[PDB]
């Protein structure tokens, strides 16, 4: 093993191995072990070593519903931090642990059968969004739409649900109206960032390119599309040489969309 964190996980492992039921004092130590190491999980190297050594343990504590939410959140949060911008962790998990996605979605829905709890929901959404979503994994539309609906109070959460729906549609066909309605509402949100704007846009663009009249695009979206057209054409239409290539192409694609798709 060793491994520069063998220590902390040797600890956590026998504390849980010392009693079938963790006492308040046991979970408090586990917690504190989690507080100390959290910061290293973000490290490209450390994050990978941690997942390749401790993932079995991490996933157990995240997914154990008998455990208190704050503790589950802590183990879950180690995973999310190891995953982000960390291709070798993504590949590792999705390959050596192909059932994890499904377990995660299971906990998601059990959480939504409540309470908040919204925090762990979000961590799970974050994980599902970092892992590949393929035709195989086809993830209830009803649970997700339920979580979405239950939480208009939590735009960050809705945003994460809509991100996952973009990925599910992609994996299905190929690469319903209530969802197209959610995307169109959220895409106009002023607090949404450009990368989420694109993702939601593309999903709508594709749906409308594919089903044409069978998907209804609403008036407000069309108004936003017009405002977004002039602003982004005015971006193409200055200097200097520099340019963000990726941004320029997306602008062109959205401007054209009017005369054709929308």
């Amino acid at each position: 093993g060793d491994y520069e964190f063998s220590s902390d996980f040797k600890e956590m492992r026998n504390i849980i191995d010392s009693n079938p039921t963790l006492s308040s004092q046991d979970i408090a130590r586990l917690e504190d072990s989690f507080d100390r190491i959290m910061e290293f999980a973000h490290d490209y190297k450390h994050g990978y070593k941690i997942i390749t050594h401790e993932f079995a343990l991490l996933a157990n504590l995240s997914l154990n519903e008998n455990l208190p939410l704050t503790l589950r959140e802590l183990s879950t949060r180690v995973i999310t931090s190891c995953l982000r911008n960390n291709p070798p962790v993504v590949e590792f998990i999705n390959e050596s642990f192909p059932n994890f996605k499904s377990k995660i979605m299971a906990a998601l829905s059990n959480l939504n059968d409540s309470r908040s709890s919204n925090i762990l929901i979000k961590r799970y959404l974050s994980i599902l969004n970092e892992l590949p979503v393929t035709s195989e994994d086809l993830y209830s539309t009803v649970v997700l739409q339920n979580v979405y609906e239950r939480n208009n109070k939590d735009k960050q959460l809705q945003i994460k649900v809509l991100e996952l729906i973009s990925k599910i549609l992609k994996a299905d066909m190929y690469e319903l109206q209530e969802w197209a309605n959610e995307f169109q509402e959220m895409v106009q949100n002023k607090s949404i960032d450009e990368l989420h704007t694109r993702t939601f846009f593309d999903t709508l663009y594709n749906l409308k390119k594919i089903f044409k009249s069978d998907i209804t695009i609403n008036k407000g979206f069309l108004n936003w599309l017009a405002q977004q057209c002039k602003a982004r054409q005015s971006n193409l239409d200055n200097g200097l040489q520099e340019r963000d290539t990726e941004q320029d192409s997306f602008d062109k694609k959205l401007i054209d969309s009017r005369h054709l798709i929308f």
């Binding site: 910061e39 490290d43 070593k49 949060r77 999310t80 982000r84 911008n85 450009e194 290539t245 990726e246």
Partner: protein
């Protein structure tokens, strides 16, 4: 009598050790599995930590943890560069007999170590990596230094080796080692090699000549305060500002927050080497608030353009000084992981009217590799 002699790249931020085994050269991973080792030393009540262990516990021990000692080695306390460098150090540097020396507290008493000794501690750890890997003790090494190092700086490097229990049979120039790692020494007519070496905190360029198989350093130029960390820092600073504008909280003083940020910023930079934009996210970043921000490669390059551009002025200077025209350069060697940044590659190639740099050996390991090649007497 020399035993198995090893090759060591003793860098400002990272060190690397290699050995020729059965006519193959292998870069050697440390106890933590890493092929490159932080040039760090930390003093605690109970421990003298070296390398990975030392750099991990930097946070809560920010003044018994020594780094960048390479900036001090062989130099005088009154030297301009030592004075300037001393300010930006979070540990104590005292004048001992006119030379800079570090002063730490263990405990709670004051202890003083020369740059030779701290270097020797780093060299000792590299040696022991080689001993774990080989079946035995090693007593001799080839050690590399920047090409501009003077006689005092080279002797001090050999002295650090003695302290590690190493007879340094030869001190080799870093750009030469990397050229050797690329077999650029099999000329075969005189060749002019430019070595472009962008490290974690320093930037070097050297024009080497090779004929008959004898290297000769023609010119050097560079910037002691320009490196990969500076680029990461521009991302970090961009993130700190984004978060302040959005939530009103300034995380500049929050060490845990900072540690998380620097690491994600490093992961972001790596992503932008292959993607055109990325998201940076940290759950429960401060005060129950999640951080979520985007960075495009365009913004990242804009943040760093003056810095990226400053790397060409030394390239020109090295051509002027030598008298060479660009067309007279046969080979462009890339050293240092930051050379994998597309904009960095593009600027250099474009500077040489489109010609491709030699890249194929890991650029963080090329120096050690060439060191190990030499050590095979």
């Amino acid at each position: 009598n020399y035993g198995t002699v090893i090759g060591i790249d003793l860098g400002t931020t990272y060190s690397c050790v290699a050995v020729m085994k059965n006519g193959k050269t292998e870069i050697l991973a440390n106890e933590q599995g890493n092929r490159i080792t932080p040039s760090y030393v930390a003093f605690t009540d109970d421990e003298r930590l070296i390398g990975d262990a030392a750099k991990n516990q930097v946070a809560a021990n920010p003044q018994n943890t020594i780094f960048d000692i390479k900036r001090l080695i062989g130099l005088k306390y009154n030297d301009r560069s030592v004075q300037k460098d001393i300010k930006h150090l979070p540990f104590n540097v005292v004048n001992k007999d006119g030379k800079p020396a570090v002063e730490v507290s263990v405990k709670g008493e004051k202890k003083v170590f020369t740059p030779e000794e701290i270097s020797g501690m780093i060299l000792g750890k590299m040696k022991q990596i080689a001993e774990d890997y080989l079946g035995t003790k090693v007593t001799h090494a080839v050690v590399t230094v920047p090409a501009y190092f003077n006689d005092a700086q080279r002797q001090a490097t050999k002295d650090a080796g003695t302290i590690a229990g190493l007879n340094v049979l030869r001190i080799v120039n870093e750009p030469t080692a990397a050229a050797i790692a690329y077999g650029l020494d099999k000329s075969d007519k005189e060749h002019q090699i430019i070595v472009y070496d962008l490290g974690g905190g320093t930037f070097d360029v050297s024009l080497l000549s090779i004929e008959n198989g004898v290297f000769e350093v023609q010119a050097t130029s560079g910037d002691t305060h320009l490196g990969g960390e500076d680029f990461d820092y521009k991302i970090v600073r961009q993130l700190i500002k984004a978060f302040k504008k959005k939530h009103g909280i300034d995380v500049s003083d929050n060490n845990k927050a900072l540690a998380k940020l620097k690491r994600e910023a490093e992961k972001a930079k790596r992503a932008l080497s292959s993607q055109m934009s990325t998201r940076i996210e940290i759950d429960s970043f401060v005060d129950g608030i999640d951080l979520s921000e985007t960075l495009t490669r365009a913004k990242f390059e804009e943040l760093n353009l003056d810095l990226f551009k400053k790397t060409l002025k030394p390239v020109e200077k090295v051509l002027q000084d030598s008298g060479l025209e660009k067309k007279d350069v046969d080979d462009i060697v890339l050293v240092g992981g930051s050379t994998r940044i597309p904009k960095v590659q593009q600027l250099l190639e474009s500077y040489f009217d489109g010609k491709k740099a030699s890249k194929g050996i890991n650029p963080d390991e090329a120096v050690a590799y060439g060191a190990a090649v030499q050590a095979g007497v």
